[PDB]
Amino acid sequence: ANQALLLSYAVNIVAALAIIIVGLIIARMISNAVNRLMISRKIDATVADFLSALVRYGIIAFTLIAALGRVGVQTASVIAVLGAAGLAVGLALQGSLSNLAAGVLLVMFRPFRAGEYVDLGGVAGTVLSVQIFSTTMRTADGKIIVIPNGKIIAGNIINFSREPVRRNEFIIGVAYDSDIDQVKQILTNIIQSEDRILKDREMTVRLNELGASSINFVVRVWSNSGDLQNVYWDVLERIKREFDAAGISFPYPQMDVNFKRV
Amino acid sequence: ANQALLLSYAVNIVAALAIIIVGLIIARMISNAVNRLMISRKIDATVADFLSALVRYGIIAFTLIAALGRVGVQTASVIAVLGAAGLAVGLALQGSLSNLAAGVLLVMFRPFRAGEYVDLGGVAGTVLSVQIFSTTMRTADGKIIVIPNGKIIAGNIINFSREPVRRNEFIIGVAYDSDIDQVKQILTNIIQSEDRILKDREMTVRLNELGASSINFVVRVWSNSGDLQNVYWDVLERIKREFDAAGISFPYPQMDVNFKRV
Amino acid sequence: ANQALLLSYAVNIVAALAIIIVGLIIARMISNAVNRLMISRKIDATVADFLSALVRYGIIAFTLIAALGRVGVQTASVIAVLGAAGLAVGLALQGSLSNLAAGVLLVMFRPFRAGEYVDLGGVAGTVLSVQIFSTTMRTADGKIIVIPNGKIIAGNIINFSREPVRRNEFIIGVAYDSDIDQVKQILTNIIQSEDRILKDREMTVRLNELGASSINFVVRVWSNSGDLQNVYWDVLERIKREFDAAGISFPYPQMDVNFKRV
Amino acid sequence: ANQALLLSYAVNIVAALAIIIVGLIIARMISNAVNRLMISRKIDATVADFLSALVRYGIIAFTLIAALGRVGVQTASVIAVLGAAGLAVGLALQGSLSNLAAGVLLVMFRPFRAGEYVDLGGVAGTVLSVQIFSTTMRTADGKIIVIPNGKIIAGNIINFSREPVRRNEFIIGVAYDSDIDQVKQILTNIIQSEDRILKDREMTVRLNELGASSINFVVRVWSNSGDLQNVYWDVLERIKREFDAAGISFPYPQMDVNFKRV
Amino acid sequence: ANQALLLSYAVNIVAALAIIIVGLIIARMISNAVNRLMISRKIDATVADFLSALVRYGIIAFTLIAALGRVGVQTASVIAVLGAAGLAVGLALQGSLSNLAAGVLLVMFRPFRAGEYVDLGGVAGTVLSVQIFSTTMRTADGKIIVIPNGKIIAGNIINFSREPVRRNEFIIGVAYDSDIDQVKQILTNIIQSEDRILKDREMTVRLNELGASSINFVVRVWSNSGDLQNVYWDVLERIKREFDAAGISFPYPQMDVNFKRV
Amino acid sequence: ANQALLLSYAVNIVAALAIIIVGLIIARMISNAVNRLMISRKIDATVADFLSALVRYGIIAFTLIAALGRVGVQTASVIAVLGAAGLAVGLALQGSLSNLAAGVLLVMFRPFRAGEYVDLGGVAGTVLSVQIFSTTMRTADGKIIVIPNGKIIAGNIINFSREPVRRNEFIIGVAYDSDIDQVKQILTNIIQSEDRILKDREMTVRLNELGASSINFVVRVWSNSGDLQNVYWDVLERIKREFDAAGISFPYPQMDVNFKRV
Amino acid sequence: ANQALLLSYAVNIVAALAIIIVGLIIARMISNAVNRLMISRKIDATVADFLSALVRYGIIAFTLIAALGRVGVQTASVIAVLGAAGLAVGLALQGSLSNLAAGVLLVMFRPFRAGEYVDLGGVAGTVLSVQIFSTTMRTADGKIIVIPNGKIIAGNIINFSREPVRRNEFIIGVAYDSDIDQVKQILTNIIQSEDRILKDREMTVRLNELGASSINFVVRVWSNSGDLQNVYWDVLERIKREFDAAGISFPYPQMDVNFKRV
Ligand SMILES: CCCCCCCCCCCCO[C@@H]1O[C@H](CO)[C@@H](O[C@H]2O[C@H](CO)[C@@H](O)[C@H](O)[C@H]2O)[C@H](O)[C@H]1O
Ligand SMILES: CCCCCCCCCCCCO[C@@H]1O[C@H](CO)[C@@H](O[C@H]2O[C@H](CO)[C@@H](O)[C@H](O)[C@H]2O)[C@H](O)[C@H]1O
């Protein structure tokens, strides 16, 4: 019935609620101002949202410490409990944070961009988009692959499309009795008559290996990246036709058999 | 017999029990209110339950600190003991927390959905459901596979079903003496007469490799994802029948044998 | 000989021993009450025992801090020493704690149950029991395998027994000159006359591959999981007998030999 | 020459030495009492020695803090230095602690016991003893293998000896022209006349595969674990003899050769 | 209406804003001065920017602590909140920090430089540039590979271009009946007449292996790194021509066939 | 010119230097005494040196705290700086500490000793010495291998030399038409006449496998470890000679060829 | 206009700058003295530079704490900010610190030295130098390999050059009909007439294996490390010549062909 204490306790609860409200307002205002200030300085929008969220949650933590102190909770208790809750949220969000930073780095440095054909860690396909946590790519046969961004930046990135010009390599195996000069001359005429092969680049035509059943010639020629596959197919069909017309044999696997009738 | 101290000790125990009861009530009320507030803001229900549990356990920690302080335990002692107990519970729950966050991300971004055929880290099957800690899938032969969610989001996700259209590839090997133009013409007629092959897509028919015993042709054609397997089977049987009717040989493995009767 | 201090020191030692005794009693009582309260709420018994042990050891830590403070040890010293001892015990018990939580999750979500045939990380067998730290399984040839629970929940779980119906697949290779329609008709009659094959499921019989020495047909049929192996054996023996009666050849490996007598 | 301070300093040094001596005595006494109390409660002796060592070193830490405080070292300094020394000793002893806990678990749950034949992580042999840090096993050819206990409990444990009964499997390949009923009848008579094969268990004799050069029959029969190898050898020799007597051929690798004299 | 407190609160807010402004100014000035001082001492520019950023953010942290103390936030609260925000930013930036330090080390010690052909962890190509977080290289066929710097310095670095002189190795297989002295003499004449082979280096020509179908000779010769591939091709073609002119046979795979007409 | 303060500051510097000197002396004395006390108790010398170094550095830390407090540095500052320096030294020394503890364990438990032939993680050789951080072994062909001690104790240790007796195993393949009883009788006579084979051990001679071209017999016999290789060589040469004298064939790889002249 | 406070603030700033200057001077002096003292005690120069840098930065930290305290920053704030900056620098320098300690250990214990041929983790070459962070080696074909020191000390180190004497091993396969005594006698005469083979070492010449097409003899002989390759080549050529002169056949791969004209 002695209300002098009950009024003080209710007034402390009201002061705590008022501190909570004013602190949430001030946190939203200051975080929005810092976000607009970072966006005006051409900071990346994701980095700006991340730092603004950190500012907002820090001001809210100051507010919670002040209010819970008004209702008698000690500062060490609030700091320990907020640290435990933040550690739990951080353990939950750790992988997403790694993927988020990786996606910012991928958009910032552009090791690849949408439309390029890439090989990310052994999967290969055309990049479709880099998103907040993962990259989507479409394989040559139309499957969709989703890869987390952190796994992408942690590994090698092979970009098939970045270079305008790329090299074909042919390995032609001919019979051991084939005339070497005739083979080199025919392959040279074939790659010389192909307009899509760049003549200012290397145009290797060399005997390369003495194989088990055949001698292997290597042909290396450069082309624009959009012509590479068609040049490979056209040159291969021309090699087949010209070697057939010239009598140069493509050998079947060979075997000397030393007969013994026991 | 001097009860002035015993009454003070019993009154402190009663005050501690009252603080415990009122704190549990306030924790349940505030956590339920924060949960309803998050659900009204369209926060995901699992994220809302997680943050509400954090709020409830934090208020209960404040309550325990106040009560145990009433019975003479120091604030540093309660904080150290609650931190040890929370570290033990967190070590127990760490993997479940990772799987829980991963399941929220899988439901939120939908790299796959129920009914799609996917390949998650080398196992492949039709997704049945994403659950709180793990995803269930059924393989093509009817086995059930359970995969933890964190393992899924940490790896590549190959979605066979997301794209409406997908590509078949045939590798046909024919004898070296086969006429190349006749082979290409027959394969072109076969894929031209198949209505389920999309004519506005690529329809590759090229000589692709000079193999050991055969020259390999590659055929690449696109179809709707529901037609892919049936188109593969029908085109393959037609290739067999047409090549038999045209006299184009499918070669057995070849071997030149250079006989020597020693 | 001035005993006024010695009596105070002995009385402090007696007060410390009394605090130890009363604290152990209160810890046992409160932990038993919390355990019964959790068991009444249908909490899993292992989770209840774990949380009750945490409550008991925390109350004992408060008791030790109070008693050692009575004998003059400072609160920071007791907290540091108990933290070191708890860190040592936690390093000793870390793997057991992971296995314990994993076993609770396995019993709770039942990815598999006793009697089911499963494949856990490359070992396969019939589950016998999930125990507190490890699962026992018996392989098909009668070996016993013990697997820690944490290793099980961290990996893929392939359950062969969960689905009532499962699919057989046959790969039959026949000679290239075999009549395709006759082969498909014979295989269709065989799987049509088998009562244990489910006729409402897929019943694939397709030419599948042009192999090196043979054309391979694929047969896919569904059966109840208890009939799968017997259906495989019966259908395979019938395929052998019917193909022998019809004259359809199973080819030996083939080789074209181009003879050259040098 | 004013000795009033020098006497106080010497008396503080003497008080520190006395606190050290009395604390070492009390630590040894209390740790021995706690050890006897744990051994009386049937706690495992290694666990009891570990917890007793923790109690002894904790009491010695309290003693060192009190004594070094008597000679003017601050409590925070002693706690930081003892924490650094304990962290160094713990880094040195971490792997031994893991092996010690693993050895306690191995002795407690007996996944294997001495004399059993086991496969621990790809090495296999007869267990000789589980020791404090590592297990010794002897391989079939007499090599000794020492494995750390933590590596053992972290992996799969395959116990060949735990089950009284185990299964043999034979894969017999016979010529394609062999009569299937005659082969099954001969194998059935062989396993029917073998007394060490358990007749109440499965006795599979089925055609299992159409191989490249042969049709493979599978025979599966159960025996007592001590009879398994002898039953395998006896049944295999009987299969060889009976198939020779019946004219059933064991095929050499086959090859159809399509001759072409070019 | 009693404004004596409201004026004090507004004056504290103004003092906090003034401390913020002056602290940001002083932080920018001191960090710029420390950066110019480090650049004058020939510290690497990236290391200087990193340490200057650390100095600037530390002075800003002191400023925030002072200002938030002026508005009543406690020093422990500001330190805990800034530590949580810095831990979040550090978890986001950890991989970038590792790549940044690795790039500084790569530029500083030059294990490779732009234009050199290197093999970094199994990918090989010509280095194009070392950048702040990753290295770019172009493969021999024109693909671009991006590798994070930390992955590069953590692994082996094989530099094909650092040494002016490099060794070719030929493995020539000849028939078993070939005269060994004639083979060694022909190979010696070939490598003796090649001007691009360094005569002061090793010029090995030895029988090296008795293979299955042939005896293998090893030839090892050194050349300038720019001549290595051309010397390999020229010597190989000369070996083919000279062995053909001398009648030394390159053997096909051999097989003794013990005929048995059963 | 008012020297009353300057004298106090110089006297504090002198007191700090005196505390440093006396503390270094006391640290050396106490650490030497503790080292001699541990060596007298038969503690291993490396463990004694490690604990003595910990005692010495801890006393030096107390000395530094007292002296730097005399010159006005606060205890928290000295503890934080010494903790940072000790963390840096510990990060530098962590791997060496692991190897040091592992070497103590290897010398203490003797899984192997100098002169024994062992297999440590896939490398095999004769142990030469266990040193403070690594073990040296010489391979059979004379290469020296250095292995860090921690890598050794973390893995399996296969000791070829610990057991006096070891088992040879022969796999002899004979023609399918060979008489089984004659083969077993000849192998039994061979191993019966060899004095270095232990007759009280197992002397297995069983048909073991029906191979592709041969039936394989297994022979298992025990010998003293010093006789194992010589017994293997002598028994193998005797098997060759006796099977040649008895007409038992060692088969060449077999092939049934079904000729077809197309 | 009341300058009594402004003068006090300026005097505190001047006192902070003076403390900074005097502290930098004292830090440089004390660190140089400790470095000279360690170098005089034959401490390794890198270890001395590391510990001197730690001493210098610790004294600078004490100086910064005192100065920033003079300008009103609290000790806890300076310690937290310096700890964050030191944690950032330590995360940047962690891998370099591991490589630095590893390089000190490599120079100190000399598992290898410059000029020796070693195999470090699967790459092999002649060591050129051990540097502060990485080791350089040149491969046999002249490529340069850079390996971080920590990766080297963490793995096996195979030293080909440390032992003066090393063993060659020959595996000679001869025809099954070859006389065993004649083969052993010829190989024994060959290795007996070779002066560079050490006659006091093992000189094994034993039949070793009954292979598919040949019986394999093993020859093992020791030589000085500089003679090993030349002895291998000379003995191999002599084996070829002597076996040709004696009529001992080197077999081609064998095949029994059981002809069947179907
Ligand atoms: C009290 C502060 C509250 C707010 C901040 C919360 C922070 C929570 C931190 C949780 C512990 C982080 O512990 C982290 O674990 C990963 C495990 O791969 C390791 O570091 C990892 O970072 C990323 C994830 O961020 C991984 O993708 C990466 O493979 C690895 O480098 C380190 O061990 C440590 O960086
Ligand atoms: C006092 C606070 C009480 C409440 C909060 C309790 C927190 C308990 C934290 C326990 C330690 C966590 O330590 C964690 O270990 C894993 C080990 O893979 C690593 O981090 C890991 O996170 C997830 C699990 O959450 C793993 O699936 C992932 O592979 C890895 O990145 C880091 O090392 C660290 O994030």
Ligand SMILES: CCCCCCCCCCCCO[C@@H]1O[C@H](CO)[C@@H](O[C@H]2O[C@H](CO)[C@@H](O)[C@H](O)[C@H]2O)[C@H](O)[C@H]1O
């Ligand atoms: C309160 C201070 C605020 C400012 C400073 C912020 C620091 C943030 C530290 C986050 C935790 C770092 O935890 C780190 O995790 C990685 C995980 O591979 C491990 O260390 C790692 O360092 C680098 C990344 O820097 C990795 O490329 C490397 O593979 C590994 O050695 C260690 O576990 C620890 O160095």
Ligand SMILES: CCCCCCCCCCCCO[C@@H]1O[C@H](CO)[C@@H](O[C@H]2O[C@H](CO)[C@@H](O)[C@H](O)[C@H]2O)[C@H](O)[C@H]1O
């Ligand atoms: C302030 C105290 C100053 C004095 C004491 C200094 C201690 C310094 C500790 C540095 C951090 C140690 O962090 C350590 O990292 C290794 C990384 O494999 C892991 O533990 C490791 O221990 C040894 C090395 O000691 C490794 O061979 C082993 O593979 C692994 O178990 C743990 O993460 C942790 O034990």
